[PDB]
Design a protein around this nucleic acid. Sequence first.
DNA 1: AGTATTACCCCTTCCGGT
DNA 2: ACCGGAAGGGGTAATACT
Lengths: 192, 175, 487, 487
Amino acid sequence: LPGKLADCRSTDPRKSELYVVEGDSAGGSAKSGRDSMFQAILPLRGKIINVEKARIDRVLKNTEVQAIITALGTGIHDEFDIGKLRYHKIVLMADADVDGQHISTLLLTLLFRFMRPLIENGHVFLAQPPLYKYKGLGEMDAKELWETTMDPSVRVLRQVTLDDAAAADELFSILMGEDVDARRSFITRNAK
Amino acid sequence: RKSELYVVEGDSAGGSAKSGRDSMFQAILPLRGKIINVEKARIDRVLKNTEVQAIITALGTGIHDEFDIGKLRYHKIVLMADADVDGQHISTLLLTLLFRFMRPLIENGHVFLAQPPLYKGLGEMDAKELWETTMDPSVRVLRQVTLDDAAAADELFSILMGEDVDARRSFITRN
Amino acid sequence: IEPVDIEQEMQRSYIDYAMSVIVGRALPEVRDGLKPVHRRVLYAMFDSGFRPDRSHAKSARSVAETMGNYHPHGDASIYDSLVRMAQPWSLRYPLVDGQGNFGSPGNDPPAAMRYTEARLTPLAMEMLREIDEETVDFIPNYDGRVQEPTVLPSRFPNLLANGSGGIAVGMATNIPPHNLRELADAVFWALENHDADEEETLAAVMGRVKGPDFPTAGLIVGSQGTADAYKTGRGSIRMRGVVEVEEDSRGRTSLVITELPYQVNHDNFITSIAEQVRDGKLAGISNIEDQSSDRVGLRIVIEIKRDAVAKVVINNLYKHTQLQTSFGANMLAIVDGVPRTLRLDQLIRYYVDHQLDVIVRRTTYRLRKANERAHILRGLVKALDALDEVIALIRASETVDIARAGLIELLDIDEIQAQAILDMQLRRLAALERQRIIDDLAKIEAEIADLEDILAKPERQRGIVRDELAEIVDRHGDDRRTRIIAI
Amino acid sequence: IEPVDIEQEMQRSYIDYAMSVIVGRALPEVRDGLKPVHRRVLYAMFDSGFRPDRSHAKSARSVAETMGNYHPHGDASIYDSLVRMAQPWSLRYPLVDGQGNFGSPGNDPPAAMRYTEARLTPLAMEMLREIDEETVDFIPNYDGRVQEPTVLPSRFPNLLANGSGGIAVGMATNIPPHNLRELADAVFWALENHDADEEETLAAVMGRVKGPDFPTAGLIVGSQGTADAYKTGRGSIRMRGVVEVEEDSRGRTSLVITELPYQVNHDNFITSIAEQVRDGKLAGISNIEDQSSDRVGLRIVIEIKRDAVAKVVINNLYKHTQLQTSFGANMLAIVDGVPRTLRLDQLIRYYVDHQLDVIVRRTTYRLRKANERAHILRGLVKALDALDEVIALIRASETVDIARAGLIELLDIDEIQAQAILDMQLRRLAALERQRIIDDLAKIEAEIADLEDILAKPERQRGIVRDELAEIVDRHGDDRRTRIIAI
DNA sequence: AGTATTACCCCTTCCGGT
DNA sequence: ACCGGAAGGGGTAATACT
Ligand SMILES: O=c1ccc2ncc(=O)n3c2n1CC3CN1CCC(NCc2cc3c(cn2)OCCC3)CC1
Ligand SMILES: [Mg+2]
Ligand SMILES: [Mg+2]
């Protein structure tokens, strides 16, 4: 298991939850205000590698990608087995600025490229923190983090759904592919 | 026979002295902070630090029994340190490392100490200010270390930087 | 090109470094109880405008201010000190109010300088009370640009209330935290009995002060160690946690740990117990779990399988797994620039003397300021007595200089007073202000007499100190967190 | 839970990030020629008081101020920009005066930040000239506490005199530095010929400005790449180093490289030459060494053994080891929040319009201030007309409000005028001050007339801009470090 | 080996253009 | 393969004492 993982206590996959959060200060703040029975925190580091651009042999040596794959438990590509999944709820919790919105899209594209059935089965969720009472998740303490985000009784989560596969396949390659002219044209068209 | 070695701490002062030196007859070696106390740690432990190995590789001579002075690469080893209290500690640690390992290198006159002008160190001085004060062979002033009594120096070294704490405290209080 | 020796250079450098570390790096101060880094950080936060009546400010600004103006050292150590001063589990009375992730009792590290914010606490503002009234000395900094104080007023005994800990060259210092409410009684006894000898003062102070009161509650076993520490200045105090026995529906017994001794890690405890359980240690444990929630506190569950009825397992935990530890109190402090080992009465008397000196200096400064203001106001009212002539002479003057000369030669008034004479505002010419001047002069000439009377009698100074300390203790008070039991 | 879908979230997140990067992260503003980080650093240093008149201050203080108040980002990206703005080999005209180890053209890092000090330069003062006179708009920062400018006055054309370079999401920008005098001539022509169309203005500004002037001296071959860059916005500019052939006493021929093209690493050049010599296929080369002393400058020595007469070795060095390189000029800027590629005439006209708007706003602010100031002097002289009656009324009153009402009823004045009369000092009641008030009123009226006349005719604003720009250019200005040769 | 002030330093990713 | 704004994080030493 990854050395930065803080595993939960319950051994039943149907009730556990895994939280993927950028940085270490946010992870340390969340570790104090979490329910140790059904919540595990996995702190990443920096920005994720772009799987859509790099080759397979390069993304298989990144420490963060290997740690995520080990923590999730399932295989990758054709070796994916849904029965080996450890957490039935993988929740992405990042900051509210543009850098967080980019780390989130990198993680989502990684999960779509490698573990598409996870998105297909709706095991992936997104967590939104409060705006103002806050420019980062590291400025919050345990009590405020619990009272708004991690409390199962009072919280709001978003479920990512996949209806059309071809549209997602083309859009991911357009937005995060090697080509630049198509990306620039898309950005200019969608700006207005 | 004409080259000189300048030992400094940190890459800031190291680069500052590198960019303001005479590249013909001057070499600069930077370190990474305080030195491991050789007198306290075992020989195996000190012989593993990545900085002591760098020092011995730079000097080129042997250590202890297998010491040959004919393999020396620089005929002038100058210890450069900041003027604060820390600069008076790191240097002294080095003054142990040369005494314990390369003992017959000191009494011959191959070790010198520089005197920076009175800044909080050499990391603040730029390239130009490090020439006309400490590195110009016609303007610089150094101090040469000499050995007169061997037993007295050894006992002073053991008292000051040994493992006994009460003796060191008594010596510090007395003097 | 000078033939210096190696023994002389070695001795000089080592002695200089050792004296610098001993006097200005690690050992605390008897009068204030703060190391130079703590005092510099507190003064930088006070002067820069970070106060409890203002919103939180980023710690980066205060750290940079301290690093630039006052403390010429690294940033990591300054930030570590700032974070430590704001941790409730490390300081009995915190001196910094922090917002953010400031750390955990376990192995979790605090966040970076960019995220956490910090300001002063209401108890910390009592340390800097009346610092601009020449109560303490000032000295120039390293580059000679600005001035910094040599010691804070320290209106409350911070040294004993918060403890101390430090490592120097050839010396060490360890002082345990105490309770402010019981230190107040000792200080009052010292103030009221200034003609007491050493033995009587020591006996009375030790009677009034029971023992240390660690911020993490816990337990203290025995009473000989505290007596040895207070009588001499070096002694061991035995600290112990609390263990609670509970059962379940199926009848399986359990052990609950909710408190741990001072300066004992939480993760290290759990790890050591787990490893010794995996190896052949203790007597019997089924499994160990941690349930220390944020809203619950500390709760460590240990399962004893079937036997021992949770009687000898507790003793094994006490004698094996750091559930009972020792505090090696050794009270070392710097007096007039020299380290010394002191008893309780020594610290109490030194603090009382410092408070008395601060009060005397403040009274003298206030008296001088009031006297100068009274002189100015008396000259002003003497001018006001002849307002028609003054205004007539002022109007018929070529320039200000001749008007000032005529004012000096007419009213028998020297300089300074004449400058304030010419600095009248017409708004202050109505009869209301012409009587307000009389009222102000009447008030000030009585304030001067009151201040002189205060300065003339030491009993007034002692009463002032007693009243202020009593008010401070009444506003900020705490109970005995640590319970002391017999052997 | 909410079914947020996958396409909408992806599009929203990536579009938001890309737009933020394009607008406020990489591309510079045409009017000011500064990225947001540079503008925030300059404003923080200007407001904190780090001015050329005052001594150097620690860079840690400036970084902390910029990060806490204006820039909500990491400290590395702030200090890196701060140290890059003070590097002579990177900026044609530095905007920061830095003391300490600020880096080297090779692989030496810039000192950590606790050893280096920084302050503003005279050029940055001209950049921040008259910023408090409502010349530019202000917006609140991220936390809404204080206000920060959205654009600096930029009294001199920083964008073209310093160049730019940046990478964004979907585009990139690169603009080479120019010469100040040549830009000044083009701006003067544009000011004097405001009615010219695009083609004539472009031809004139291409005639006045010859080509880029990199801070590292060097060389440039051809005249078509600069023409393409100026006419279409994209072009390729070829740069070349300076090599000299020398001979020793024995007769061996040596090549001395004394200048290198823009943004070429000194150590990587020697490393590449040595590796290519070791691998062969380059030429007959004896050895390569660096004799670049601090007091000598760049000096790279290459030895050729016996052949080539030092002619084909030069061509091989041109063709294989980066001694001759290319610059992909692509002028991209932000106009009104939109990224566009512009020619030289556009970049001149936009700056001219910005200067005219700044001058108009400053003149309007000064006129408003003078108009509001004249009222107090008019009230003061009106009171001076009946000074004796005013003084008698003031004396015969019980409260200041009664005096205010009496003054308003008597002198027929506003509340502000009566207040100014009341807070008039007695020292201003002499004859000299009585005449000084009249002189000040006359001068203020004359200044109001002059300021109104300035706004009356637009033909004076162009003259004012020309005079200020001419003074700025005559104060600071260099010559063509990079010379243009033929093919 | 762990408490607390001190000294110093490097190594992954994103985003184009040649 | 860098050029420049951005995200994030670990590891060697001194010095005492239990
Ligand atoms: O050299 C190294 C090698 C490895 C390493 N691993 C983790 C790590 O965090 N760091 C590692 N390093 C270095 C470094 C951190 N470095 C020093 C502290 C600095 N603190 C941030 C800061 C400092 C200041 C601020 C604001 N923020 O304002 C006032 C002045 C000082 C950030 C960069
Ligand atoms: Mg952030
Ligand atoms: Mg230093």
